[PDB]
Write a protein that binds this DNA or RNA. Structure first.
Ligand SMILES: C[S@@+](CC[C@H](N)C(=O)[O-])C[C@H]1O[C@@H](n2cnc3c(N)ncnc32)[C@H](O)[C@@H]1O
Lengths: 108, 76, 88, 94, 328, 98, 99, 83, 108, 92
DNA sequence: ATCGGATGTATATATCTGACACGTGCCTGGAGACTAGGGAGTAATCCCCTTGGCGGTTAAAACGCGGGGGACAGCGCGTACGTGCGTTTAAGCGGTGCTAGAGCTGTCTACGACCAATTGAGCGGCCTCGGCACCGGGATTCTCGA
DNA sequence: TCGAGAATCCCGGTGCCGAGGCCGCTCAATTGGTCGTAGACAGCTCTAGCACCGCTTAAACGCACGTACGCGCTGTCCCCCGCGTTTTAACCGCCAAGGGGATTACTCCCTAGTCTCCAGGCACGTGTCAGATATATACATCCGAT
């Protein structure tokens, strides 16, 4: 028969559709899983990982680095307003904190 | 001829081999007599890491030589 | 002989005064009262014995005697605190 | 003995499309694996609960879509819906 | 090669090998011997006058002569005041129970000669009922002083471990016969060495104890249903027994008599037990639970104070519940 | 001699530690603290070394975020020094001591 | 010449009145109009079961009453009696809402 | 049919009545526009989630269970309406 | 055969063991459900409902009422220290609030 | 043909307070209470079977989910109440 | 405001290591093709309950006046915290070594899903009495001005 | 310290509707087998956690001075509370209309499941460069003095 195409390639995605489809079947979420549900979900996870790596690669460039360090992931999420709403209850190991001094504390 | 395959646990076994036998053939005979899979074996001859493509006579291995067995595992 | 367990005794002292200053400097505070350090050793006493006990009781359910990095993650992430990088 | 699975091959493909010259350390890749597994459990857990509210036994792309609207904040939910529907219409065309 | 001490009450002499049984890092037990002399120094409160003129606090126990100047002289200078053994006044009566300071020293001394590797006591299945822990000397002394054991009670320690609890009870209570039962093979093996060693260091000081028995067995068996109910006071360390066997102990304790005392680490009944129509078969119906005063170092697995509780069986509470159910 | 005015070195330490990502508690006293809290469970516990680092990363992230809310309570009362009633007012609004 | 309570006495009398009752404190028809105009920005012709408007009000009452409890603690902390807008802003900041 | 300016229907006596169940005995005059802004942000978040539960059910009526489900996923779970 | 006994009666309970067992099977919690799991869970739910009705019936008696009103459930939960930890994020309809005036606000 | 816990909550009153009642507005709050702690315990026991790669929720997973969720003295007396019912169910 | 001394801090170049990133072989998990069965899509119908309007009663909101209490600024004083220097305690490091326990495989049996038949528990509808809400009239208490 | 006056609790009556008990009846839980696989268990292996060691030195500890911040006090003044009059629209009760919630029947197309297959991702090994470190110098920052 014809040569096999992965479901990620015919959806135009980078994340694995077949692995996400297996994790939905083996996760006790529903009795049955539709065919477009792992295609939709793998596109959302690929979108959200492309936003953080966009902003963290910008933070790595502002410190003249060519690798992303957990500090750059922390600076990316806390300086973006909507990534800070998702990951507001999330602590990142070796991530640190944003530089922030209250204006009352600065000397006169 | 025979060889000595010393493990890191303290077990040195006697294996009857031939100089035309490869390292792939040495790693296949230990599974026949000890049950250790071929992806879990590394051999030592005078500080070398032996390759499955070449034979025992390509590395100048005399009979009754002490070969050491570094245990690699799939993960860690 | 003596004994079956060497009991560790104080160990909250432990978390010293120049280590609470330099936890409050990341918090961005400029001046610190002398009564903060006894107050801060009691909070990190209540916390981190809620995490353990909720970390153990994942260890006894697995019949396992050794509390792993997961079951600290799953202890946190149960208290509304998600920790990345240890790793689930 | 058992081999592991992660998203590290796939996070690294997304990174080369976005910043083709930067790299990533192994501790930052372990945080990106924790991020993908966290957002997976939020979306699949909410979509599981929507099928149970509506007395359905299947999870479709309609239920992934409304779980994205419930969970993501404003402009993230707008663009992730448009990325998801773009993938399904390309998947079902060919 | 050896060094010997002599009993004041005519018992068998002691043995201390010169390949010394050092136990921990630094207690290096010649400190055992030089403190053993100090308790026999006042029994008999006239060894301090009989041995003031030459001895002093001395270091350098690595030499054989430093014990030897102290030990055979103790076999010799005892007779400066032992010599009155005949003719007008006997020594102390054997029917004397020790003081709490002397009993603390004997129980520490019997423990050092009995358990050889105390890390073997940690060999158990984790989170099982068979985990190991001990109760200190100070809580059992609190427990003996806050129950009032008459001359006819019967003491049983369920899960006696190595058995140090029943040795303190049998040497501080005038009762009939005491028991301890242990399931695990490692502490019950030390309990047999602990049994012999307690008796020979009890005639050596010349003190009496009540009679006791350390047994192997399971108290959840059919032999023990009859003889848990027939005892007056029960000690149990139920801190990690778990709910499945704490439920089994409640339906053995429900057959105890009036005034039956139970001292446990965890309660078998709440401290705030309200009785209604829903919990009439509970065991808190027929008992009154009080919490004892916590002390420092009370248990052996942690440093913080752990308080044990006291249970008293009275079937006069459910009647007082039934004495207000009729007229309204 | 030379001497900085009070507050100058303290602001210099705000900039020092809000720039770094390291752990600020010593590791052996924290590990010794963790092993003595776990003594309350009678049985012996073993603590894989990655779990103690997960407990320290979470305990320091808890306290740094608590001093941020504590600092806002001191500025609200027109003070510059934090004080134990600022920790108590922050933990009550957060929903911890109530 | 008429009777006149000192300021603060009637207010404490109203603390004890409304902490004893369980009734709703916002008028019901003005609250229902507010729900229907916020919902216009999401869906055009919504229909709103009358139990759903009462569930929205019971949640909005409980949110605001619990917010004024934390607002009151922020005003006592600054040694005041009046609540001010910076007390609401501090209370929502520590709670994790204002950020 | 167009409906506008209804936060002013939440009046100064009603906000004062809510503060006194909360235990406040004196209120500044600038509280009343803060409280209308806080209550508008709170109702926008709950109604947005309640409408996307009833769009997914393909209904045009917001039911009481849609409000209970929307409140539950914000941590504000609510008893007494069918949940 | 023998006359049917319910599983609640042979467990000594009031809550339905058979209904709880059906809700565990139809709730997508696991592939398989043990036999003692609905017996254990129905005993916990019967215990927790007996504590609230204990405390709410005491609150109804303190107001000289013979019926439990949602105010009495609110007064029961918020005056018990451990029921307030479970139901701390729970709002009860027509429940009101505890009477509590700060001591600074009381007149001099 | 719609079901609730109202029959079973009303039986627990007459054991506890044999001469009080509930209004129907507060009975519905008690039904919301039972359904809430049902899905908390069954939801946590589902994760415990998944963390340990089991496929069965047993009475042990319900026990350790009670110890995770209930605070302090509630968890002590719900565990002893649940073990009493299981040992009576298996001995009858 | 300006100036200089001193301390911190940013800048640049070297050098060096270990971790990222690439490559290769391989196995297991994803893909292609097919069948069978039931979930849900679709339509049609019923009747509930949502909406819109109306009018009247009156509770509540709005407006304004008036005055006192509280917010706020200023000042002064004493104390306690920061800074820095010398002393001291133990953390950190690296290296070695033991052994135990976590992870693994292989049997094997008991436990739970599935299915069929049967009946009693619980639900719906039904009366109906009493708890409670309302109303009024009395005593008790609290606040405020003396 | 004491009388006026305004709320508040307390003590009875009337009226009512909602909670409680009764009954008839499905349908969901129980009984009874049965099968197959999940989980318990024994055995085995080797990674990683515990413990110990000595050394170096980073960091904690302790001390002392002085400064600036907390805190208490006072005074101003204006803004908030309390009250009375007027006005507005909530609320209730009622009527009427119809959108759409809720249900049922029918059938189709979508998904689970199966087997065959094969290629992508994982493990492993290996090489080099990014980043850390060090040192020296340049320069920006603080602070006492003028
Ligand atoms: C915590 S130790 C108590 C030792 C001693 N009672 C003491 O406090 O010094 C509890 C002991 O009870 C024993 N045990 C547990 N279950 C038992 C049983 N069913 N029958 C006899 N002993 C049991 C265990 O072996 C365990 O060593």
């Amino acid at each position: 028969r014809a040569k096999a195409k992965t479901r990620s390639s015919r959806a135009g995605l980078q994340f694995p559709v077949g692995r996400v489809h297996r994790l939905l079947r083996k996760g006790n979420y529903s009795e049955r899983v539709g065919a477009g549900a792992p295609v939709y979900l793998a596109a959302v996870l690929e979108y959200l990982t492309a936003e953080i790596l966009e902003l963290a690669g910008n933070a790595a460039r502002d410190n003249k680095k060519t690798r992303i360090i957990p500090r750059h992931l922390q600076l990316a999420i806390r300086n973006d307003e909507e990534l800070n709403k998702l990951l507001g209850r999330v602590t990142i190991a070796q991530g640190g904190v944003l530089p922030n001094i209250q204006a009352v504390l600065l000397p006169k | 001829m025979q060889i000595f395959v010393k493990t890191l646990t303290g077990k040195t076994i006697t294996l009857e081999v031939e100089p035309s036998d490869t390292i792939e053939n040495v790693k296949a005979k230990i599974q026949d007599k000890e049950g250790i899979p071929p992806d879990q074996q590394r051999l030592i001859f005078a500080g070398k890491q032996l390759e499955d493509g070449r034979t025992l006579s390509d590395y100048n291995i005399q009979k009754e030589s002490t070969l050491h067995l570094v245990l690699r595992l799939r993960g860690g | 002989a003596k004994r079956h367990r060497k009991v560790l005794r104080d160990n909250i002292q432990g978390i010293t005064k120049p280590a609470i200053r330099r936890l409050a400097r990341r918090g961005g505070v400029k001046r610190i009262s002398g009564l903060i350090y006894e107050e801060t050793r009691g909070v990190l006493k209540v916390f981190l014995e809620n995490v353990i006990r909720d970390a153990v009781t994942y260890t006894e359910h697995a019949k396992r005697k050794t509390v792993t990095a997961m079951d600290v993650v799953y202890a946190l992430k149960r208290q509304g605190r998600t920790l990345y990088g240890f790793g689930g | 003995r058992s081999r592991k699975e992660s998203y590290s091959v796939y996070v690294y493909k997304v990174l080369k499309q976005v910043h083709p010259d930067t790299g990533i350390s192994s501790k930052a890749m372990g945080i990106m694996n924790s991020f993908v597994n966290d957002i997976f459990e939020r979306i699949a857990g909410e979509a599981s609960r929507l099928a149970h509210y509506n007395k359905r036994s299947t999870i479709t792309s309609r239920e992934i879509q409304t779980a994205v609207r419930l969970l993501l904040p404003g402009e993230l939910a707008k663009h992730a819906v448009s990325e998801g529907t773009k993938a399904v219409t390309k998947y079902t065309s060919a | 090669l050896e060094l010997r001490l002599k009993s004041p009450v005519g018992a068998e002499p002691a043995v201390y090998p010169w390949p010394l049984p050092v136990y921990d890092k630094h207690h290096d037990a010649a400190h055992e011997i030089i403190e053993t002399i100090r308790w026999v120094c006042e029994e008999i409160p006239d060894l301090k006058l009989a041995m003031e003129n030459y001895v002093l606090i001395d270091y350098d126990t690595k030499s054989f002569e430093s014990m030897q100047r102290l030990c055979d002289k103790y076999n010799r200078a005892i007779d400066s005041i032992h010599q009155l053994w005949k003719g007008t006044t006997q020594p102390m009566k054997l029917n004397t129970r020790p003081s709490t300071g002397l009993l603390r020293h004997i129980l520490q001394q019997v423990y050092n000669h009995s358990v050889t590797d105390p890390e073997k006591l940690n060999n158990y299945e984790p989170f099982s009922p068979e985990v190991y822990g001990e109760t200190s000397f100070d809580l059992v002394a609190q427990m003996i002083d806050e129950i009032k054991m008459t001359d006819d009670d019967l003491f049983v320690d369920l899960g006696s471990g190595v058995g140090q609890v029943v040795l303190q009870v049998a040497a501080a209570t005038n009762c009939k016969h005491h028991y301890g039962v242990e399931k695990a093979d490692i502490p019950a093996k030390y309990a047999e060495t602990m049994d012999r060693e307690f008796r020979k260091w009890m005639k050596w000081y010349g003190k009496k104890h009540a009679e006791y028995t350390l047994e192997r067995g399971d108290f959840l068996s059919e032999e023990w249903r009859e003889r848990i109910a027939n005892t007056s006071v029960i000690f149990v360390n139920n801190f990690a027994f778990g709910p499945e066997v704490d439920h089994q102990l409640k339906e053995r304790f429900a057959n105890m008599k009036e005034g039956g005392r139970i001292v446990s680490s965890k309660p078998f009944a709440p401290l705030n037990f309200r009785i209604n129509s829903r919990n009439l078969s509970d065991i808190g119906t027929i008992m009154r639970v009080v919490e004892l005063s916590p002390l420092k170092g009370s248990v052996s697995w942690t440093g913080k104070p752990v308080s044990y509780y006291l249970h008293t069986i009275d079937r006069t509470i459910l009647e007082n519940y039934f004495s207000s159910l009729k007229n309204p | 001699p030379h001497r900085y005015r009070p507050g100058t070195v303290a602001l210099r330490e705000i900039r020092r530690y809000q720039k770094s990502t390291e752990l600020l508690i010593r590791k052996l006293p924290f590990q010794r603290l963790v092993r003595e809290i776990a003594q309350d469970f009678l049985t012996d516990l073993r603590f894989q070394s990655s779990a103690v680092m997960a407990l320290q990363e979470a305990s320091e992230a808890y306290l740094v975020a608590l001093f941020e809310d504590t600092n806002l309570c001191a500025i609200h009362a027109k003070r510059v020094t934090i004080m134990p009633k600022d920790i108590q007012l922050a933990r009550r609004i957060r929903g911890e001591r109530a």
